[PDB]
Amino acid sequence: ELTQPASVSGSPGQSITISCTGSSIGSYDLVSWYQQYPGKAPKVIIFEVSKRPSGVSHRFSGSKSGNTAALTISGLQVEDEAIYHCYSYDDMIIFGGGTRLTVLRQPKAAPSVTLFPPSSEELQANKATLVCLISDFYPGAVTVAWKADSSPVKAGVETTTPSKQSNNKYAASSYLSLTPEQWKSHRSYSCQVTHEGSTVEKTVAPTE
Amino acid sequence: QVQLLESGAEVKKPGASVRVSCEASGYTFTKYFIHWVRQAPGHGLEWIGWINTLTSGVNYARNFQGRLTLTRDLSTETVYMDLRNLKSDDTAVYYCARGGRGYDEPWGAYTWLDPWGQGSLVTVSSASTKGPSVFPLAPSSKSTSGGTAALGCLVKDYFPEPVTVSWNSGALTSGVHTFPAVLQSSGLYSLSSVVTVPSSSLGTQTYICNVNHKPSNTKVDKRVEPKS
């Protein structure tokens, strides 16, 4: 119902805009924006399209055009790093997916990906788990896609949220649970990690 | 000053029910709605219902009429959320939030939601305490620096956290990366622990991951052999 981007990136001092689009945006003038730091509760920073609560930095500002609302952060500062949710109403309170905004504090770094096939022990036990370990990527925002041969695979995928390493890059894991037949039946399986417009793909075949 | 305070985290079996409280303070309890919004990990916030703290009138989301019950206690200024017939997809952080403006406007609950309680984590898992299955991750030099190989252990299906992993009884520490666990839809955790070691030692040095799951009193020393 409400569509907003998963992750956004911007350097300090510059400006950027997060877009939220939905049929409910044009209907009412209730679209709002909520800021959420990790481990804490969301907080309103823009409501009724463009109104700003007292105590909120004046750098935040909102607007809408047609069925697309927009939150604009001018003079980006480090404490703006957070999740920003859009809020509207369509026969009930409804929210977007949330946008992870990262204030770049180091160079964008692509992930290292390590892909393990199922253990022969696990296979002989009538189970199969492909393990895709992702590390050393900044910012902490990736999308993982599993492919059987070339066909995408959505069923059986379990992926963690990124976690901050000691070098302040991020790590994450994705697991593809598989039937032994499914594993032996295909030429290969691939773990595709997209990150900041770049992609890293590792592939394993049952004949290895 | 204006504060909403929720109860602690909960762990429930499927089919059970859970009661989360929300203690208000610093404002006229009966002038503002109390909404309830949950946040499943890696998902968008979802509204489930509000209660008029003055009249006790309620309004739930379509997916919750029948299994949800919101009540209010005027004397303790507390709202309670009762969710029945818990499924595994009910796992989420549950927030309460004050409804902006009040019971005077038609959209007097949908103006702004502020403040929010700190949230209460509810975890629906069919699993009582359970020890892990540990499988070997055979060495692979494909995505490691030159001359080294990555090997590890897959700690599959355990509950609850935590799990600790060492290698060779702690003698091997450099190159160890224990990744945070994933909470699967089954309600069970799984994690991996890998270690980058010299590729020449594979045929000489023994590599054992020492997994310790104290909740289930389970310990596993899994030797990781190379696949010749």
Author numbering:
A (entry chain L): 3 to 9, 11 to 27, 27A, 28 to 94, 96 to 106, 106A, 107 to 210
B (entry chain H): 1 to 52, 52A, 53 to 82, 82A, 82B, 82C, 83 to 100, 100A, ...
Copy text verbatim from the article accompanying this structure deposition.
The CD4-binding site (CD4bs) on the gp120 subunit is an attractive target for HIV-1 immunogen design. The VH1-2-derived bNAb IOMA directed to the CD4-binding site of the HIV-1 envelope glycoprotein is of interest because, unlike the better-known VH1-2-derived VRC01-class bNAbs, it does not require a rare short light chain complementarity-determining region 3 (CDRL3). Here, we describe three IOMA-class NAbs, ACS101-103 derived from the VH1-2*02 and VL2-23*02 germlines, that share many properties with IOMA, including an average-length eight-residue CDRL3 and show up to 37% neutralization breadth. These findings indicate that IOMA-class NAbs developed in multiple HIV-1 infected individuals and provide important genetic and structural information for the design of CD4bs-targeting immunogens aimed at inducing IOMA-class bNAbs.
The cryo-EM complex was reconstructed to a ∼4.0 Å resolution, and we also determined crystal structures of the unliganded ACS101 and ACS124 Fabs at 2.2 Å and 1.7 Å resolution, respectively. ACS101 uses the VL2-23*02 gene for its LC and includes an eight-residue CDRL3, similar to IOMA. In the CDRL1 of ACS101, two residues are deleted to accommodate the N276 glycan and ACS101 CDRL1 makes contact with the N276 glycan via S29LC. While shorter in length, the ACS101 LC also forms this short α-helix in its CDRL1. This is particularly visible in the crystal structure of the unliganded ACS101 Fab but less so in the more loop-like CDRL1 of ACS101 Fab in complex with AMC009 SOSIP, possibly as a consequence of the lower resolution of the cryo-EM complex compared to the crystal structure of the unliganded ACS101 Fab. CDRL1, CDRL2 and CDRH3 of the liganded ACS101 Fab in complex with AMC009 SOSIP showed subtle conformational differences compared to the unliganded ACS101 Fab, possibly due to the lower resolution of the cryo-EM complex (∼4.0 Å) compared to unliganded ACS101 crystal structure.
